[PDB]
Amino acid sequence: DTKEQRILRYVQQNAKPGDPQSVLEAIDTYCTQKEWAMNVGDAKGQIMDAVIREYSPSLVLELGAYCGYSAVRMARLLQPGARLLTMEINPDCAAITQQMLNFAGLQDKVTILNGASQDLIPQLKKKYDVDTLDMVFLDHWKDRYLPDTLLLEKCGLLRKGTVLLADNVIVPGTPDFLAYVRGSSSFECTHYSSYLEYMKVVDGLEKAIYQGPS
Numbered sequence: 341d342t343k344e345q346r347i348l349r350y351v352q353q354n355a356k357p358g359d360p361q362s363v364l365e366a367i368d369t370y371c372t373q374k375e376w377a378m379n380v381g382d383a384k385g386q387i388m389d390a391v392i393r394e395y396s397p398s399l400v401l402e403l404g405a406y407c408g409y410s411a412v413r414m415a416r417l418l419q420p421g422a423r424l425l426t427m428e429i430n431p432d433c434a435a436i437t438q439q440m441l442n443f444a445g446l447q448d449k450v451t452i453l454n455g456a457s458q459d460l461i462p463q464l465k466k467k468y469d470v471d472t473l474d475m476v477f478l479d480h481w482k483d484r485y486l487p488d489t490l491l492l493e494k495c496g497l498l499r500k501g502t503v504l505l506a507d508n509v510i511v512p513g514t515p516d517f518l519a520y521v522r523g524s525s526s527f528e529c530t531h532y533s534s535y536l537e538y539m540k541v542v543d544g545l546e547k548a549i550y551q552g553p554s
């Protein structure tokens with residue numbers, strides 16, 4: 341029994357099938373109250389929703405799927421015809437993500453790629469019929485943000501206007517990626533300040549009153 345399985349089960353037992361909003365809400369409740377988990381979460385998710393509504397992307401690539409929270413969040417806003425491709429290195433997570441999408445009724449819009457992004461990115465055009473990407477959600481591991489950006493560029497997957505959206509640029513932080521994109525004439529950057537997901541961290545005091553020795 342893993343934390344990721346407990347999340348899926350919680351969703352299966354509490355969310356309305358075919359209702360992506362109820363799916364997102366069940367995950368957020370479990371991870372707020374029961375177990376912290378690295379889903380993008382609702383505060384940042386609202387920002388993502390606003391950005392997606394702005395750009396109405398037809399083809400989105402996610403780096404890092406986890407339990408499928410952000411894939412559900414994004415795919416529920418996609419127009420008919422539009423596709424999300426999500427890359428996930430951990431097979432247990434790729435399976436959980438698939439079941440989450442199934443439950444939400446979003447499986448037809450989303451394709452899960454099993455593997456490391458750095459290995460999968462060069463396979464995109466040939467194996468998944470991709471010309472250029474309209475949007476990229478970076479949310480896998482901090483050290484890969486900058487090299488995967490350079491790989492997307494090398495492989496011709498970026499066009500003028502492609503929107504990169506990166507999570508966690510402050511915590512855990514992606515200083516190299518930020519420096520690079522902010523300093524590069526190839527990228528126009530905007531920062532959206534928010535809060536790390538699920539940070540009502542429970543702690544307590546113990547009072548222990550000495551009664552004497554035995």
Ligand SMILES: Nc1ncnc2c1ncn2[C@@H]1O[C@H](CSCC[C@H](N)C(=O)O)[C@@H](O)[C@H]1O
Pocket residue numbers: 378379380381403404405406407408409410411427428429430433455456457458479480481484
């Ligand atoms: N190089 C890589 N390629 C693909 N997936 C990776 C990777 N490095 C880490 N990951 C995966 O990236 C994920 C980070 S957590 C993803 C959270 C998700 N976007 C959400 O908001 O719901 C983990 O599942 C991890 O296994």
Ligand SMILES: O=c1[nH]cnc2c(O)cc(Br)cc12
Pocket residue numbers: 378379380404479480481482507508511512537
């Ligand atoms: O490693 C992570 N990958 C993707 N997202 C993350 C997050 O949102 C918070 C923390 Br802490 C870690 C990660």
Ligand SMILES: [Mg+2]
Pocket residue numbers: 378379380479507508
């Ligand atoms: Mg994140």
